[PDB]
Design a protein around this nucleic acid. Structure first.
Ligand code: MG
Ligand code: MG
Ligand code: MG
Ligand code: MG
Ligand code: MG
Ligand code: MG
Ligand code: MG
Ligand code: MG
Ligand code: MG
Ligand code: MG
Ligand code: MG
Ligand code: MG
Ligand code: MG
Ligand code: MG
Ligand code: MG
Ligand code: MG
Ligand code: MG
Ligand code: MG
Ligand code: MG
Ligand code: MG
Ligand code: MG
Ligand code: MG
Ligand code: MG
Ligand code: MG
Ligand code: MG
Ligand code: MG
Ligand code: MG
Ligand code: MG
Ligand code: MG
Ligand code: MG
Ligand code: MG
Ligand code: MG
Ligand code: MG
Ligand code: MG
Ligand code: MG
Ligand code: MG
Ligand code: MG
Lengths: 196, 140, 97, 118, 105, 288, 95
RNA sequence: GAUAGAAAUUUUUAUCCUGACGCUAUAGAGAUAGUACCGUAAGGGAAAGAUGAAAGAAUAAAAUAAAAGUAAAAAAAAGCAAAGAUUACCCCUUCUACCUUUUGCAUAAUGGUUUAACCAGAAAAAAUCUAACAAAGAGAACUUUAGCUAGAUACCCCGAAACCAG
RNA sequence: GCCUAACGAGCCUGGUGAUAGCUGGUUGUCCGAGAAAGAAUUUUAGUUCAACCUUAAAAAUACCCCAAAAACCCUAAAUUCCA
RNA sequence: UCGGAGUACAAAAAACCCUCCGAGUGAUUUUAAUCUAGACAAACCAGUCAAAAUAACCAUAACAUCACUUAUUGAUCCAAAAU
């Protein structure tokens, strides 16, 4: 999952010009025989100095692949499990903050020995407390993300995870549904019997 | 992603450091040095193999010299030294010849005496008459 | 092989900037969001590569099919030549056949 | 065409003088063969190579013990020009389980059971 | 290559081993890091066997220096005045112990 | 249980610095560099192979190819116009019923089977529905009203011994895809079309009573039921006296697709509404 | 064989193989004997029977036909009253 | 035959979140420039820059003195120029330069004066490995009598006389 | 013959990265095993199979092979099959 | 292109612009079927045999026969046939 999150978003904008795309090189520079030098065709051959590249990178390359659903969900479960097991996962309630001081959070983390980086996870985006928003808008190692923004790469990048209790319930109900679900006859976006 | 080689200096130097004592352009030009270094290493291996043979021949020549200096031929000296259960290799025999003239003369006298003992035994063709130095001792 | 004689300035790059902190944050948007949007919509780039992958010939064909009518003259000609060359090399050339 | 060679039975009919020439017992045959490979299987036919391989004689100048049965005697006759064969001699009898680690094979063709006593 | 490199005769310093044996290794200075993943072998050797080696050989002065370094090194300085610097970069504890014993010997 | 979790406590932090894939999951790629993989780079010596100009697959060097010397014969002749029927075993039907994927209390249709994931139908592959086979007719003990497109006498007898109802109907590909995927059709935004009649090749199959044709004469049905009962030696149950007789007798109109719906209705799922035509011409067309 | 098409970029198939061959789902291929309709008056009854009889293809020709045909022809097929439905599968293959 | 190849019928949700696991002066546009120059013309078409805060600090200051080519410092019997060595540079002994093509090359068969920078393996149908789920698999369309999905394993460069159109 | 220093048919641009069974080249280390040709082919300057061989996986028999056995006017070295 | 003899002496195979015979069909009636084990040969395509069981004649054979009997023959596609 960590490799997939890094790779599937990649589109390499590396395009070099082959011998057919270089400007000139439309005629033979010299006749085949009698000159005494090596035989050549277009002066834009890859052997020549100003010639094109033999293979090189060709056009925008889209590195895109989709891992299966039960592999991505399992990776999320394993990330949560290892974070809990290594004493790096902390459950906080309601994510309330007494003051908008960004330095207060740093002192709280240092006193609780959370580490260098902390990822706070909230349930919703518009329901975030403005105190926490203002506190984490100026901090680098402390990152505030909503419940739909949880990912293995960020969970491994940040040393400590902090989850709100409704977020814990939300993640629980999201991850436990794939254990006993059908294969999608049509995409789960469209209305189902029990699924929204 | 254009990838170029930056340690080409060290790659060339790792080969050129073994060719600095060569003569001509082989000690400077890299194209001429790789072939010279490879042949140098091949010759080094071949000569390491031949060094044992060359030194053995040198030791044999020295043992001869010191043997006909005592009026004894090398094959007779060697066979009669073996017959006396004296298992000294050619290197040690040459060392004794160069640095221990008296010990080498004693060895030559013993080998000769064994030679006349064998000759007398062959002439006599008798089971009972046996020489003093011709007796064979078993392992203990 | 002449290497530079001076040390280059050390590139002081921070691993905790905005992009390196927010990278891949919404990759599980579908999984954790009552499926409404695939991770396809999060792919930013050319129109013909938003959630697609293929070899050079397939990429060229797809590019010509979608944006081929809006191309420039010289790039369209180069694309046609490249398509022809890739077709010929892929179908008539090779070892395993 | 070069093929395998049939050896007539008259070759293996020992003469009365052969026994005292080669130190063999004319009336009890010996029990075991000590077989050593002298020459190489290079420039030799593939069937001879296979016989040498199946006789366990890959490494030259290394003795191997075999039975005195006609089944192995046939192959020994096939490759008899590449090997030296001696009769195994047991002056002190078969080695028991207590003398397995103190045995030796002297070059004269005998197996000593008590070797290097202290 | 003999003709390419230098050569010397079989010699011993101070006619060592004649009157008494003196360990020719004088000091061993390890330079490592506490945060570099490459210095894992050096760190674990320091935790485990540096004390046992020091007790076994009291005639060698052992220095250990943690510092922000990427290539863990060991500098052995002998009674001859000779300084041999070896790299212990990404080697297991068994290999480090073998190298230290070789340097001492 | 999972002692790896306990072992993880002593181990350091799991981060992006220390991540290793499965040993053997990724076979390393080999490039034509070096003494071994260089020197013609695995392409061999001169010829067409090294220069990459060897002929196509079936070509044999001017000789008449094997795939061109064998005479043509009809094997796939009209393969894209032959009707296909996915088989459903009575053992699998029993498995579905007893695991609860499908319920015998309600009428079971191809829609219900698809919803319960018992069968998969691909209309674009010329599939014409689900047929019934008798792989597990020995241990079939469920009383279920089955509607399929093709049925065998043994399967029909096995169902009737328990006391179910078997009926075979026809579906042209459009009505078939609508029935397999009603939800994608309901968000399509079109009224439900009529069910087309079977072609002349299938009219006799659905007009007879022995195969339980949906267009057959219902008064001939008890005769054929009694024939099968006397042939297979099982007592024919009095189905009219069962509590689920209405469910067992629930049918579909030959022009109707679903259960209880009518052709021409628009199912607005957003407002949970049904829009029905009122025009005389529209009603005549939809009921013709 | 077109490994990469020009329009869709997919892998095409040769129509001769599908016209004069039949693939069973077990991996075997079915074909007719060559010359079963030519000069029947000149041939013996046993030879005519051999010509009329169906035959199989070995591993090399089977692999060639698999390479030359797309995976669409390798699907599982349930035809109505299919004569080869009984031959689609393999039984008692101790390998 | 090589090959070509639809359609009926389906899916596609508004805006920002846009920059770069693209190059750094033999690379990246040919470009400092379609300019010099070569051509009657159509046309072809380059190489060239490096101190510093200040050169209104040129009795001007600091880092390499590292490629090939020379000087410091021409050479002393004998030999693919090297190795074994040796107190000692040679002198002694031993090895028929390297790739390519060939049954076979020191061959007097081909290629290269030297240095620097560029210059040549690319595709996932069937299969192996790994992993998820498994009579089911896949984030929509298909495949399924242990199978479906995902990932990793694969297939070069230069060279004609020629043909057509303007 | 000449048609701007090469005319059995000019030069430039484009098709064009024309095509070559033909020649040349194909760039790091080490380790394991390792092949000289039967049949087709406008084919013998090449391809496609078979026999060999390489990496994996299932099994159980595999080479040497005594008798006995393999044609009829004469026929050697010796072959095939098996304990 | 196909067959026979020697080369190729005794299971099989084995080449030359090696030495010789031939074949690209005739005559007659016993007008010589269907289906299927198991085998020969063979790169493939092709060529060969064939036990049991069925239809019609003795109620006991049917391999069509002879000419050195071995060769007397041609693949797809396509055209004409009309089952
Ligand atoms: Mg061009
Ligand atoms: Mg041109
Ligand atoms: Mg020249
Ligand atoms: Mg050209
Ligand atoms: Mg340029
Ligand atoms: Mg360029
Ligand atoms: Mg040795
Ligand atoms: Mg590759
Ligand atoms: Mg490879
Ligand atoms: Mg190679
Ligand atoms: Mg090379
Ligand atoms: Mg060739
Ligand atoms: Mg032909
Ligand atoms: Mg299906
Ligand atoms: Mg043709
Ligand atoms: Mg430039
Ligand atoms: Mg210089
Ligand atoms: Mg000399
Ligand atoms: Mg070559
Ligand atoms: Mg020649
Ligand atoms: Mg060759
Ligand atoms: Mg010559
Ligand atoms: Mg030459
Ligand atoms: Mg030549
Ligand atoms: Mg060359
Ligand atoms: Mg030259
Ligand atoms: Mg694949
Ligand atoms: Mg033409
Ligand atoms: Mg002219
Ligand atoms: Mg070419
Ligand atoms: Mg050719
Ligand atoms: Mg090897
Ligand atoms: Mg060879
Ligand atoms: Mg026998
Ligand atoms: Mg046997
Ligand atoms: Mg056979
Ligand atoms: Mg019969």
């Amino acid at each position: 999952v960590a490799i997939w999150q890094k790779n599937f978003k990649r589109i390499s904008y590396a395009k070099t010009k082959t011998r057919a795309e270089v400007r000139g090189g439309g005629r033979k520079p010299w006749v085949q025989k009698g000159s005494g030098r090596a035989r050549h065709g277009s002066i834009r051959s890859p052997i020549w100095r100003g010639g094109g590249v033999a293979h090189g990178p060709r056009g925008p390359t889209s590195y895109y692949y989709m891992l299966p659903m039960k592999v991505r969900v399992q990776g999320l479960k394993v990330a949560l499990t290892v974070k809990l097991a290594q004493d790096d996962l902390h459950i906080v309630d309601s994510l309330e903050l007494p003051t908008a001081d960004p330095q207060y959070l740093i002192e709280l983390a240092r006193y609780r020995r959370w580490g260098d980086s902390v990822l706070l996870v909230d349930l919703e985006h518009e329901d975030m407390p403005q105190n926490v928003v203002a506190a984490t808008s100026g901090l680098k190692t402390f990152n505030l993300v909503p419940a739909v923004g949880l990912n293995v790469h960020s969970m491994l990048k940040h040393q400590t995870l902090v989850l709100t209790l409704p977020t814990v319930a939300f993640l629980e109900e999201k991850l436990l549904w794939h254990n006993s679900r059908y294969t999608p006859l049509y995409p789960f976006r469209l209305p189902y019997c029990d699924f929204p | 992603l254009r990838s170029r080689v930056t340690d080409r200096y060290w790659r060339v130097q790792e080969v050129l450091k073994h060719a600095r004592h060569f003569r001509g352009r082989k000690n400077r030009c890299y194209r001429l040095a790789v072939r010279a270094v490879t042949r140098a290493f091949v010759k080094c291996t071949r000569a390491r193999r031949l060094k044992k043979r060359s030194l053995r021949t040198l030791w044999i020549n020295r043992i001869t010299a010191a043997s006909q200096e005592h009026g004894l031929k090398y094959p007779a000296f060697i066979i009669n030294l073996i017959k006396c259960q004296v298992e000294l290799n050619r290197k040690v025999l040459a060392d004794l010849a160069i640095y221990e003239p008296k010990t080498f003369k004693s060895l030559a006298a013993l080998a000769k005496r064994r030679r006349e003992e064998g000759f007398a035994a062959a002439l006599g063709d008798g089971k009972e008459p046996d020489g003093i130095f011709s007796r064979v001792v078993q392992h203990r | 092989f002449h290497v530079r004689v001076t040390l280059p300035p050390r590139k002081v790059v921070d691993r905790w900037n905005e992009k390196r902190a927010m990278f891949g944050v919404y990759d599980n948007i579908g999984i954790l969001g009552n499926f409404e949007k695939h991770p396809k919509e999060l792919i930013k780039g050319p129109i013909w590569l938003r959630g697609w992958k293929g070899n050079e010939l397939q990429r060229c064909i797809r590019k010509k099919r979608m944006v081929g009518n809006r191309m420039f003259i010289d790039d369209l000609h180069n694309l046609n030549k490249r398509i022809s060359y890739l077709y010929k090399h892929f179908n008539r050339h090779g070892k395993y056949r | 065409k070069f093929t395998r060679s049939r050896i007539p039975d008259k070759v293996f009919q020992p003469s009365p003088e052969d026994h005292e020439k080669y130190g063999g017992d004319p009336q009890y045959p010996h029990k075991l063969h000590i077989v050593t490979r002298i020459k190489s299987t290079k420039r030799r036919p593939y069937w001879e190579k296979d016989i040498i391989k199946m006789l366990g004689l890959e490494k030259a100048h290394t003795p191997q013990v075999h039975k005195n049965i006609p089944s192995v005697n046939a192959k020994l006759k096939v490759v008899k020009h590449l090997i030296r064969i001696k009769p195994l001699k047991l002056p002190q009898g078969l080695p028991t389980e207590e003398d397995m680690a103190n045995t030796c094979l002297k070059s004269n063709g005998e197996l000593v059971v008590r070797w290097l006593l202290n | 290559t003999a003709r390419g490199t230098a050569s010397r005769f079989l010699t011993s310093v101070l006619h060592n081993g004649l009157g008494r044996y003196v360990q020719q290794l004088q000091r061993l200075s390890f330079s490592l890091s506490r945060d570099a993943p490459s210095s894992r072998g050096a760190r674990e050797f320091v935790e485990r066997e540096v004390t046992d080696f020091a007790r076994r050989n009291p005639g060698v002065v052992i220095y250990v220096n943690p510092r922000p370094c990427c290539v863990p090194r060991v500098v052995a300085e002998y009674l001859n005045g000779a300084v041999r610097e070896e790299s212990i970069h990404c080697k297991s504890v068994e290999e480090i112990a073998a190298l230290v014993q070789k340097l001492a010997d | 249980g999972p002692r790896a979790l306990d072992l993880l406590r002593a181990l350091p932090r799991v981060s992006l610095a220390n991540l290793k894939p499965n040993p053997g999951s990724r076979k390393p790629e080999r490039r034509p560099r070096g003494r071994r993989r260089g020197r013609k780079c695995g392409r061999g010596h001169k010829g067409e192979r090294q220069r990459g100009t060897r002929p196509r697959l079936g070509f044999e060097g001017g000789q008449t190819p094997f795939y061109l010397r064998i005479p043509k014969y009809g094997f796939n002749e009209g393969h894209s116009f032959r009707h296909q029927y996915q088989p459903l075993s009575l053992n699998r039907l029993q498995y579905l019923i007893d695991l609860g994927r499908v319920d015998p209390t309600q009428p079971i249709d191809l829609t219900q089977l698809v919803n319960g994931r018992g069968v998969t139908i691909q209309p674009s592959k010329r599939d014409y529905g689900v047929q019934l086979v008798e792989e597990g007719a020995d241990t079939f003990k469920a009383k279920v009203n089955i509607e399929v497109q093709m049925a065998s006498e043994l399967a029909i007898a096995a169902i009737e011994k328990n006391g179910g109802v078997v009926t075979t109907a026809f579906y042209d590909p459009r009505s078939l895809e609508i029935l397999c995927k009603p939800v994608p059709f309901f968000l399509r935004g079109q009224p439900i079309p009529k069910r087309m009649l079977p072609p002349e090749a299938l009219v006799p199959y659905y007009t007879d009573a022995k195969n339980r044709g949906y267009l057959a004469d219902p008064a001939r049905f008890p005769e054929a039921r009694l024939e099968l009962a006397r042939k297979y030696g099982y007592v024919l149950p009095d189905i009219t006296k069962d509590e689920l007789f209405k469910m067992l007798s629930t049918r579909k109109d030959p022009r109707q697709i679903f259960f209880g719906l009518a052709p021409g209705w628009v199912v607005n799922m957003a407002d949970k509404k049904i829009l029905k035509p009122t025009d005389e011409n529209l009603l005549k067309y939809y009921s013709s | 064989v077109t490994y990469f098409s020009s329009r869709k970029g997919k892998r095409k198939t040769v129509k001769a193989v599908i016209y004069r061959f039949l693939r069973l789902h077990s991996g075997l291929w079915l074909r007719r004997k060559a010359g079963y309709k030519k000069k029947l008056w000149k041939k013996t009854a046993a030879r005519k029977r051999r010509l009329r009889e169906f035959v199989f293809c070995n591993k090399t020709q089977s692999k060639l036909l698999d390479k030359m045909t797309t995976s669409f022809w390798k699907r599982r097929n349930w035809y109505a009253d299919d004569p080869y439905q009984k031959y689609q599968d393999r039984t008692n293959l101790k390998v």
